[PDB]
Paper text:
As fHbp binds human (hfH) but not murine fH (mfH), novel models are required to assess the efficacy of fHbp-based vaccines. Therefore to develop a physiologically relevant model to test non-functional fHbp vaccines, we sought to define the basis of the binding of fHbp to hfH but not mfH. However this extensive replacement of residues was not sufficient to enable mfH to bind fHbp at appreciable levels as demonstrated by far Western analysis; PPX, the meningococcal exo-polyphosphatase was used as a control on blots. Additionally the arrangement of CCPs 6 and 7 in mfH with respect to each other is distinct from hfH, distorting the entire shape of the potential interface with fHbp. We also demonstrate that impaired binding of the murine fH to fHbp is not solely due to amino acid differences at the binding site; structural analyses revealed a different orientation of CCPs 6 with 7 in the human and murine molecules that would sterically inhibit interactions with mfH. Initial efforts to achieve this by introducing multiple amino acid changes in mfH proved unsuccessful, most likely due to the orientation of CCP 6 with 7 in mfH which would sterically inhibit interactions with fHbp. The chimeric fH consists of mfH CCPs 1–5 and 9–20 (enabling interaction with murine C3b and other complement components), flanking hfH CCPs 6–8 (allowing binding to fHbp).
Factor H binding protein (fHbp) is a 27 kDa surface lipoprotein consisting of two β-barrels that promotes resistance against complement mediated lysis and is a key meningococcal antigen that elicits SBAs. We have shown previously that fH CCP 6 and 7 (fH67) are necessary for high affinity interactions with V1 fHbp, and that these two CCPs are sufficient to inhibit binding of full length fH to fHbp. Here we characterised members of the three variant families by identifying amino acids that are critical for fH binding and through structural analysis, to inform future vaccine design and to understand the basis of the interaction of fHbp with fH. Here we show that even though V1, 2 and V3 fHbps exhibit remarkably conserved atomic structures, differences in key amino acids necessary for interactions with fH are only revealed by functional studies.
Residue numbers in the entry: 339 to 461
The structure:
């Protein structure tokens, strides 16, 4: 069987069980391995862990761990009741109060490589 996927090493995270598994590589298309990301980062799905999949295009995702932005508290705005995870590239509309705003027309925040932009502070 073809074994085209080498031991996956990527930024801001790692496979679980890296030492029981590293010698098993390379592996075949269809195999998958659980992984986690560093604090402040997340799989694109926004879950606490996810699968790295050996595909015909190599490992997917290409960038397994991306910036994580948590939505919860908004100063002078509407806060949520529990922490909602967002990932790099996602955006939401924040509800500001009493003539305060995020100063970007639509009161939208985007999860960027360096966190929320602008921050969840209505001014």
């Amino acid at each position: 069987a073809l074994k085209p996927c080498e031991f996956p090493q990527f930024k801001y995270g790692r496979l679980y069980y890296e030492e029981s598994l590293r010698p098993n590589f390379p592996v075949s298309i269809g195999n998958k391995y659980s992984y986690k990301c560093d604090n402040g980062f997340s799989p694109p799905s926004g879950y606490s862990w996810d699968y790295l999949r050996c595909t015909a295009q190599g490992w997917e995702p290409e960038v397994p761990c991306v910036r994580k932005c948590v939505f919860h508290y908004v100063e002078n705005g509407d806060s949520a009741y529990w922490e909602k995870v967002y990932v790099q590239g996602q955006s939401l509309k924040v509800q500001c109060y009493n003539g305060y705003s995020l100063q970007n027309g639509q009161d939208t925040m985007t999860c960027t490589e360096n966190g929320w932009s602008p921050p969840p502070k209505c001014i």
